[PDB]
Copies of this chain bind each other. A is one copy, B any other.
Amino acid sequence: MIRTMLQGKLHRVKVTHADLHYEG
């Protein structure tokens, strides 16, 4: 049986930028 496990995380980082505009 196949389990889904946490691979990794960034714990409590701050969002530095947020733009609706992204083309990529």
A1 proximal to B (CB < 8 A): yes
Query: What is the 8 Å Cβ interface bit string for chain A, positions 4-24, against chain B (1 contact, 0 not)?
Result: 000100011000000000011
By a CB distance below 8 angstroms, the chain B residues around A23 are: 11-12
Contact between chains at A7 and B12 (CB < 8 Å): no
Chain A interface SS verdict (over half): strand
User: 6 tightest A-B contacts by CB?
Assistant: A11-B23, A12-B23, A1-B7, A11-B24, A2-B2, A3-B7
CA–CA, A3 and B8, complex, Å:
12
User: Closest B-chain residue to A1, C-beta based?
Assistant: B7
CA–CA, A23 and B11, complex, Å:
7
Distance in angstroms from A2 CB to nearest chain B CB is 8
